[PDB]
């Protein structure tokens, strides 16, 4: 169980789950796939 897409990423971590490529730096709160 891991913030995955769309799933919001702490401050403290916001290191996105390995599950997938994705980034939620500048982007929205939630994680979401690079175009």
Do not use: G, H
Not at 14 to 26: A, F, H, T, W
């Amino acid at each position: 169980e891991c913030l995955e897409i769309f799933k919001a990423c702490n401050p403290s971590n916001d290191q996105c789950c390995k599950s997938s490529k994705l980034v939620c730096s500048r982007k929205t709160r939630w994680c979401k796939y690079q175009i």
